[PDB]
């Protein structure tokens with residue numbers, strides 16, 4: 001039973017969950033990949049890895065993706081989570097020197113993953129491994145776009161580092177622009193393309209309906225995460241959260257911020273439903289009778305479909321993952337899966 005303050009009746013009724021048939025293998029393989037790359041201690045993987053439901057999230061998102069593509073996505077996503085934890089630990093312990101170097105190593109590895117497959121820092125090598133595999137599905141033009149988007153993500157994380165060390169709480173609009181990058185909105189949007197096995201031309205993917213649908217899907221997830229991860233981010237001295245920016249600047253109380261974030265989350269859903277019609281109508285326009293048009297039509301249709309899936313997958317992920325179960329920790333400021 002989902003708590004009233006986090007419950008979204010629309011998602012439960014209009015957004016039915018889906019699950020990739022490869023998921024059972026996905027869960028085990030990703031777990032093994034975390035062990036082989038040494039991204040987590042062997043006992044924390046045994047204890048927490050499956051309870052984190054990182055593979056569950058992506059398997060309910062990228063439906064119709066080839067197994068190898070889904071695996072690379074899941075491994076990358078798992079790295080993304082342990083990088084968020086390393087980023088958090090570097091801040092609380094004030095390891096600015098360690099962070100700046102890692103930051104630099106990630107930029108370089110992003111451009112040439114092969115050269116960093118066996119780097120001394122396992123976090124860098126784990127990153128290089130998943131990125132190299134992601135670069136093997138689609139032509140170089142896609143890889144370049146991916147790198148370009150993730151270069152921005154790293155800098156956003158660096159910007160987050162400086163804000164938390166100084167104690168600066170971003171403005172509500174300053175946060176919303178930063179949140180699009182720290183949540184990696186366009187990374188997950190790009191990953192839709194190898195999932196449908198097709199790189200979309202700019203004329204297609206920058207179509208207003210496609211753009212808006214992709215955006216709204218990411219905004220919902222990012223903002224619902226802020227709503228659900230709020231208690232664990234309060235206890236961990238995290239300052240990057242929509243609710244926190246409201247309380248700090250707009251002087252809203254703890255309950256006023258929750259309700260305010262809820263309404264923004266609810267708007268995303270109904271706004272998505274409106275543009276989803278336009279996005280799917282555009283998919284029907286692409287099918288002009290040609291083989292090419294048919295391929296582009298199917299890809300967009302599958303992508304928009306996965307944008308929809310994200311809603312249900314994220315929603316149930318925040319109530320099934322042990323990542324946010326702060327109420328069951330001995331030390332609320334230190335998650336047990338984090339080292």
Ligand SMILES: [Mg+2]
Pocket residue numbers: 084088
């Ligand atoms: Mg975090």
Ligand SMILES: [Mg+2]
Pocket residue numbers: 084182183
């Ligand atoms: Mg973050």
Ligand SMILES: [Mg+2]
Pocket residue numbers: 225226229230233
């Ligand atoms: Mg969060």
